[PDB]
């Protein structure tokens, strides 16, 4: 089969810029069987070029295409809100291949996260399961790592991410982290923390707190 | 106008079978072949395959052959796609789109794309049973903070299948709302955390009450946010 | 009720070589030539036997599109009464020819850079073909008296060359995609009648 | 049935001008309608045809300058030209297309317009004495006459004697020069025995420019 | 589609039979029109399909032939069958070709053309400018020579002719020629001739004067 | 013993009409393109006609309508008819094998061609002696002026060639008239001439004449 | 209607250069050019086809590249038998197209021609007709230039020059002019001179006759 390859994964740029996204193949493709595709989050795909050149109907003239060979090309002149998705390279030279995928994502200042501690509740603890939640609000760029200490002893195996996409306001991220125990593991030490670490924080800060603690 | 809409989503257990429709409407239909593709949750793009509306020939992916299985009825205008031997790796949403990258009559490549893309129907597999959710509550703590603002939720835990609406005050409270998305643990259910950001002067003369609502066991649960007491 | 597929003909993705043109038959559909009127700045339309105009209030038995790609200063042998490497061997039309030849220019779709070579045509021959005939033969040539016995050499050579397109070539030698509507009518319900 | 065009005229080299064609007796939407000048050196040409479904024809040296339009309301067809060269000065006819099974043919054609195109000006026209002589003078009748020369444009009107004489007088079809202009000889044939007793005046008449030319032959010796 | 047409012109008689041919330089099948046009009148539909009769036309109008060749015949000439004919072949389309034409004229006997010559004027040459006339008078047919001589010399290029209409009584033809030169290119030479050379004249007449004879 | 043999030209007059052959051997006239070339007289080549092996044939502008080609199998021979002959058609004609792309690589010898009022006319020869304005650094140049003859070639040498060093027989130039005319020169020592006897000799093979003329300086 | 054009129409090179011609087409015709070599009084040979390929029995020391517009010829190293005329082929749809043709020559240094004068004959003055005759011995290079002085006017007509070959053994040129008159027209003149003009010349020697001697 033929591999697309598409680079970058990722793409941080800030409203007006200029875009410039590429897709290799392993083996040559007649220009006449590539064709690029937009998805925004929530909704189904959309055409937006094939033929490597042309446009679909009720695009707009700021996405172009170029390229040839084994070297495609899709360039945006002049980004705008709406333009901000996820881009994907198909080819059917050979069968029928779709790229890896390519997101473009807004700009802005770096901004470190707010770091809270969440303690389980006792209602929760009465099922023999315990949660603790760590949670970072209103931080950029994505790029953010997190440690687990239970009595100045690092977990590993037993913590769960989620991350929310950028906010519609300020393009911003929020994370939350929860570490899962039963109720015997939870009683059988006194001091939870977690630890955070972001380029807009010059040192890690751990978060802690003590089993009996009002 | 061309429109194509699908089935609504799926909830099935492993080694059953699947069927999705997809009834097409405002172009002639006999002109146009039908291609499917999947998307796995937080994945790229999948191709499945590509029926001919005309006289009925199919081509296949090599990941899919032997288990999917196209059809079409062109009295109502509709395709029909039908997975088999169902396996957890098979959840995803799918999508029927309009084709123009083979031709219909003869079977020979064009220039084009995939146009005209349904809306999506996801179909989800697990060995897992209607459940609602458990709501717990999190609590600021006693630590002030330099910025006197706290944070406070509530959690949902182990309910299934997805989605739960979680509102704060129906909508009174629509500054600092977060809900996260929704991740599943290794005992196959899911959780969630809500979260929302309070000023200190309004802790001691406000109360909050969450509310999660579960379609599928049709639950609707306020729970509030107070102070831990000792 | 079925459209005619134009479409799968005028858009397809490779076209046929000259001395191989591709043939397709076309038969129990709505003939809706807008497709033809629209177009867009094309070489030529040139139809012979009836009018452009009148095409939607006709109905044929069959239609025939044949499909190939040639060279600019050949188009114009694709036409009743001609003479030429094309009209002689490779592809000829009958005198009294009835349909329609749409062709338009191929250059950034059959060039490459350092020489496309799959576009091939018919260079010796030692007869003409009668009109809609198609030649596949790849035996070698004989031009002197002493036999070839397949292999070339001094008055033996082999038959199909390459045109070699590419960009930088002249308006005249760069490729040109082509399609020939030929229209049929005997004694059948003439299954291909156009909205009228 | 019956069609009349409407638009001709004079007009620069490069400019752009529009024809109209409007026709009654007949269901204006249900025909194909085309455009075919005529010129002296090279016969009749057909420049444009539109058809019922909108879809337009043209020559090749007619492509990227016209287009051909038509209006089924107001039962009327237009054509509109742009970039002329000095080569599409002609007599244009409005016609309706017909056929019979496969064969097309033009069955009703209109009057017509003169169009010309050139870069000239309204210009006065020279009268010049074309006497009688031994030469111009065979069996007892002697020819003479008036050369008008170098004048824009056509018509010019010359008569004798106010009219007076109408038997003998050659009025010759204008010439375009090299120069831009027209130029004619209008003779007239009298028998001997009138010459030196007769008043011959030619008078030129050049309503375009307002111009009035009184020319008085005088008959040589010689 | 080059297209021809035989005679160039013709001369009959009231109650004659007249044909013309048409000649194609391919096939056209039966792909031929016959239209005639009056002076000063537009052109009418007098045959289609090479054998067809327009409906409110003449039964004695004939048209016949296939293939490379085809044949106009009127039967009984009439006055109001005086006129130009054209052939036009519909085969292919949308580029439709007329042929050159053929002028039929009223039958007239032979009438010597009478020669005159008119010298530059004064007023002309103290213009700078000098035209030479030779005019020919009642002639029949109008296949006639004129040549222009300056001192026994060719001359080409400048020289223009002028013809009228057949006349309604007579039935003659009348023809200009004019020589235009500069006033110092006439002052160049002396003498001028102008030839004449028709059917009706045993020899060429040439009409020949010296530059200051009056 | 891949070749081409050409035959079949010589003199006409205008308006006339003559065939030119070219007969093969080792080639299969009917199963290859042939064609026919001319070159006049320093001025280059030009094509004329080509033929195809399918029967398809191809004229120039300038010989369309006057021209013909045509090709005998049983004989193996290529024929080039020309009719309304003009002062313009005087060449030599080549006929060749034509490969397309690979070019035309077999080629005949050429047969000349020339259409003249002719009037086979034999030469006049004159003495252009050496004078005192003719001696420079003791050597003087002499010769022998040939005019007013027709058809080509004539030979012109000097004592049946005992003297044949430093002798320059210039190309023939045709005339106004259309007759040929040039000038065959030597250069010998002063001192060579009051003893040296010097005689050129003309020789017209197509008016069959061989003119002497001694060549002596004047007083 | 694709006209070609050779940029060199002569070349004047020595045994052991190497030498370029160039081919320029008016519109662009691919790659499909044929390059042929004539030499004097025979047959031309094909040289090089497809504009790049050798024809089976050239000699390496050929060598042509071009697309599109230009085209060019060349020769590594020249050998004696080099020196003839060559000729751009183009075949087009079924019309076949020559060049102008380009000539090379022997190089050679700059050599001052020798002038003499031949009266019109005695024999010849009988009847009717006077020619005479000018003529250069042994010069290089080709260009050269001949004036015709009657009683001291340049001459207008009557004149027509004949040029040698390149000489085998020095390659070297000798031209010869003639002026044809008739007796009437040479029978009322003394002055008849021939004016030479050269390269090598560093002034116009100008040669002549009078009649009374
Ligand atoms: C060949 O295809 C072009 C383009 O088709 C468009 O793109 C495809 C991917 C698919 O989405 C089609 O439905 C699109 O129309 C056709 O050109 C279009 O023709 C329509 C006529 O209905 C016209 O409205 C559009 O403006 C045209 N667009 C362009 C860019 O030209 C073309 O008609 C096809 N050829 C034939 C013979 O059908």
Redesign the pocket.
Same mark, same amino acid.
């Given at each position: 089969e033929i591999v697309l390859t598409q680079s970058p994964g990722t793409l941080s740029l800030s409203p007006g810029e200029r875009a410039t996204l590429s897709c290799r193949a392993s083996q040559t493709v007649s220009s006449t069987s590539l064709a690029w595709y937009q998805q925004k989050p929530g909704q189904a795909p959309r055409?937006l070029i094939?033929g490597a050149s042309?446009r679909?109907?009720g695009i707009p003239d700021r996405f172009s295409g170029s390229g040839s060979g084994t070297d495609f090309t899709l360039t945006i002149s002049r980004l705008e809100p709406e333009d901000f998705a996820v881009y994907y390279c198909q080819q059917h030279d050979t069968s029928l291949t779709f790229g890896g995928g390519t997101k473009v994502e807004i700009k802005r200042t770096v901004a470190a996260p707010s770091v809270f501690i969440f303690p389980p509740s006792d209602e929760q603890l009465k099922s023999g399961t315990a949660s603790v939640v760590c949670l970072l609000n209103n931080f950029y760029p994505r790029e953010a790592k997190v440690q687990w200490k239970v009595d100045n002893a690092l977990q590993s195996g037993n913590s769960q991410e989620s991350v929310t996409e950028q906010d519609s306001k300020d393009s911003t991220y929020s994370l939350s982290s929860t570490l899962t125990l039963s109720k015997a593991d939870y009683e059988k030490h006194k001091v939870y923390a977690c630890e955070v670490t972001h380029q807009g924080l010059s040192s890690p800060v751990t978060k802690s707190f003590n089993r009996g603690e009002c | 106008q061309v429109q194509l809409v699908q089935s609504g989503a799926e909830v099935k257990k492993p080694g059953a079978s699947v069927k999705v429709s997809c009834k097409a409407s405002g172009y002639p239909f006999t002109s146009y072949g039908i291609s499917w593709v999947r998307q796995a949750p937080g994945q790229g793009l999948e191709w499945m395959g590509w029926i001919s509306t005309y006289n009925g020939n199919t081509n296949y992916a090599q990941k899919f052959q032997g288990r999917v299985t196209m059809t079409t009825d062109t009295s109502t205008t509709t395709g029909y796609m039908e997975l088999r031997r169902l396996r957890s790796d098979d959840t995803a949403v799918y999508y029927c789109a309009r084709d123009?990258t083979r031709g219909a009559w003869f079977g020979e490549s064009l220039?084009?794309?995939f146009?005209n893309w349904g809306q999506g129907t996801l179909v989800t597999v697990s060995s897992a049973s209607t459940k609602g959710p458990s709501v717990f509550p999190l609590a600021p703590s006693s630590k002030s903070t330099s910025g006197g603002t706290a944070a406070l939720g509530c959690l949902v835990k182990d309910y299934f299948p997805e989605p739960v609406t979680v509102s704060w005050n129906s909508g009174a409270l629509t500054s600092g709302v977060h809900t996260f998305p929704a991740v599943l643990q290794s005992s196959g259910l899911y959780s969630l955390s809500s979260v929302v950001t309070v000023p200190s002067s309004s802790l001691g003369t406000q109360t909050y009450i969450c509310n999660v609502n579960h379609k599928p066991s049709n639950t609707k649960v306020d729970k509030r946010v107070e102070p831990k007491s000792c | 009720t079925n459209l005619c597929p $134009?479409?799968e003909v $005028? !858009?397809a993705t490779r076209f046929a070589s000259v001395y191989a043109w591709n043939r397709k038959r076309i038969s129990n559909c709505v003939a809706d030539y807008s497709?033809?009127y !629209?177009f867009?700045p094309f070489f030529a339309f040139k139809c012979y036997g009836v009018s452009p105009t009148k095409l939607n209030d006709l109905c044929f038995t069959n239609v025939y599109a044949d499909s190939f790609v040639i060279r600019g200063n050949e188009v114009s042998q694709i036409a009743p009464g001609q003479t030429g490497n094309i009209a002689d061997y490779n592809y000829k039309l009958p005198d009294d020819f009835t349909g329609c030849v749409i062709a338009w220019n191929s250059n950034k779709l059959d060039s490459k850079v350092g020489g496309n070579y799959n576009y091939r045509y018919r260079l010796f021959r030692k007869s003409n073909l009668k009109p809609f005939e198609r030649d596949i033969s790849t035996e070698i040539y004989q031009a002197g008296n002493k036999p070839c016995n397949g292999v070339a050499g001094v008055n033996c050579y082999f038959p199909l060359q390459s045109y070699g397109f590419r960009p930088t070539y002249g308006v005249g030698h760069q490729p040109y995609r082509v399609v020939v509507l030929s229209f049929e009518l005997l004694h059948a319900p003439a299954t291909v009648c156009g909205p009228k």
């Amino acid at each position: 089969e033929i591999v697309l390859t598409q680079s970058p994964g990722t793409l941080s740029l800030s409203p007006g810029e200029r875009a410039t996204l590429s897709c290799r193949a392993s083996q040559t493709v007649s220009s006449t069987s590539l064709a690029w595709y937009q998805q925004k989050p929530g909704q189904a795909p959309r055409l937006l070029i094939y033929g490597a050149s042309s446009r679909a109907t009720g695009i707009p003239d700021r996405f172009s295409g170029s390229g040839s060979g084994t070297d495609f090309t899709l360039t945006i002149s002049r980004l705008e809100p709406e333009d901000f998705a996820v881009y994907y390279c198909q080819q059917h030279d050979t069968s029928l291949t779709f790229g890896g995928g390519t997101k473009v994502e807004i700009k802005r200042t770096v901004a470190a996260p707010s770091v809270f501690i969440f303690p389980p509740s006792d209602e929760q603890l009465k099922s023999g399961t315990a949660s603790v939640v760590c949670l970072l609000n209103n931080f950029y760029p994505r790029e953010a790592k997190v440690q687990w200490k239970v009595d100045n002893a690092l977990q590993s195996g037993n913590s769960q991410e989620s991350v929310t996409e950028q906010d519609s306001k300020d393009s911003t991220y929020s994370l939350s982290s929860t570490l899962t125990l039963s109720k015997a593991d939870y009683e059988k030490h006194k001091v939870y923390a977690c630890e955070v670490t972001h380029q807009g924080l010059s040192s890690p800060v751990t978060k802690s707190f003590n089993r009996g603690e009002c | 106008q061309v429109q194509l809409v699908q089935s609504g989503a799926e909830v099935k257990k492993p080694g059953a079978s699947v069927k999705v429709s997809c009834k097409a409407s405002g172009y002639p239909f006999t002109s146009y072949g039908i291609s499917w593709v999947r998307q796995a949750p937080g994945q790229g793009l999948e191709w499945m395959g590509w029926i001919s509306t005309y006289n009925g020939n199919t081509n296949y992916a090599q990941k899919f052959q032997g288990r999917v299985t196209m059809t079409t009825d062109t009295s109502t205008t509709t395709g029909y796609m039908e997975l088999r031997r169902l396996r957890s790796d098979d959840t995803a949403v799918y999508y029927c789109a309009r084709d123009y990258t083979r031709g219909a009559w003869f079977g020979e490549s064009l220039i084009g794309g995939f146009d005209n893309w349904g809306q999506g129907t996801l179909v989800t597999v697990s060995s897992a049973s209607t459940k609602g959710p458990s709501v717990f509550p999190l609590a600021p703590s006693s630590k002030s903070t330099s910025g006197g603002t706290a944070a406070l939720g509530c959690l949902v835990k182990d309910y299934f299948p997805e989605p739960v609406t979680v509102s704060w005050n129906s909508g009174a409270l629509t500054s600092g709302v977060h809900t996260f998305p929704a991740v599943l643990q290794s005992s196959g259910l899911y959780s969630l955390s809500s979260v929302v950001t309070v000023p200190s002067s309004s802790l001691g003369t406000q109360t909050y009450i969450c509310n999660v609502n579960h379609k599928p066991s049709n639950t609707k649960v306020d729970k509030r946010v107070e102070p831990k007491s000792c | 009720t079925n459209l005619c597929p $134009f479409d799968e003909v $005028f !858009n397809a993705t490779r076209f046929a070589s000259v001395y191989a043109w591709n043939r397709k038959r076309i038969s129990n559909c709505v003939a809706d030539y807008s497709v033809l009127y !629209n177009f867009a700045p094309f070489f030529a339309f040139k139809c012979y036997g009836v009018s452009p105009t009148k095409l939607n209030d006709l109905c044929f038995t069959n239609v025939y599109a044949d499909s190939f790609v040639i060279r600019g200063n050949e188009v114009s042998q694709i036409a009743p009464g001609q003479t030429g490497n094309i009209a002689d061997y490779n592809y000829k039309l009958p005198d009294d020819f009835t349909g329609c030849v749409i062709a338009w220019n191929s250059n950034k779709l059959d060039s490459k850079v350092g020489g496309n070579y799959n576009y091939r045509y018919r260079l010796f021959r030692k007869s003409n073909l009668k009109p809609f005939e198609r030649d596949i033969s790849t035996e070698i040539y004989q031009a002197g008296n002493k036999p070839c016995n397949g292999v070339a050499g001094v008055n033996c050579y082999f038959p199909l060359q390459s045109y070699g397109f590419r960009p930088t070539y002249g308006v005249g030698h760069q490729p040109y995609r082509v399609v020939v509507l030929s229209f049929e009518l005997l004694h059948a319900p003439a299954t291909v009648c156009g909205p009228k």
